[PDB]
Amino acid sequence: YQDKVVDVEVSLGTQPIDTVGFETPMFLAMHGNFPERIRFYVSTAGMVAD
Amino acid sequence: VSPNVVSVGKGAGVYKIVNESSETVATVLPSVIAENHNWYFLATEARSDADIV
């Protein structure tokens, strides 16, 4: 038995996937300015704010 | 004598004007750029070495 005169399936093969990036460096300094373990900055003006 | 404001400038004669400051260019520059970033040429009055570096 069937319940539809017309039936259509649609499947999406466009799933994005996580990737690694070989750009961002890290510097492991000594301080107590912020509680978390890592902070990202785009300019020194941001660092001076913290 | 505070709160008065005094400015000194040159007239006739051979001499130079030197001003001291409780701040430094390195510690001052970030605030200036933070307040307004519409300029391109940077010149300074501090004459001594590290102020230029």
UniProtKB/TrEMBL annotation, chain A:
Domain of life from the UniProt record: Viruses
Protein name: Structural protein
Organism: Pectobacterium phage phiTE
